């Protein structure tokens, strides 16, 4: 498996440094230490994104 997910819903940056992506963006879960905000990547950028805006891939 590869620490990643998939933005079930396009996401937007609400703060300053939050990951920014759009539905289908594989968020590279870089730090799932959070229950609702995994510090991860998506397509070249990284930061905090809501683990819910994405879904875990690989199985």
């Amino acid at each position: 498996g590869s620490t990643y997910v998939q933005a079930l819903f396009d996401f937007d940056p609400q703060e300053d440094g939050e990951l920014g992506f759009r539905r289908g963006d594989f968020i590279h879960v870089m730090d799932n230490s959070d229950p609702n905000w995994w510090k991860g990547a998506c397509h070249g950028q990284t930061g905090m994104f809501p683990r819910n805006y994405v879904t875990p891939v690989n199985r």
Partner: peptide, 10 residues
């Protein structure tokens, strides 16, 4: 930290 409260999905 500033994880922010999970936003509402569309």
């Amino acid at each position: 930290r500033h994880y922010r409260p999970l936003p509402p999905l569309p």
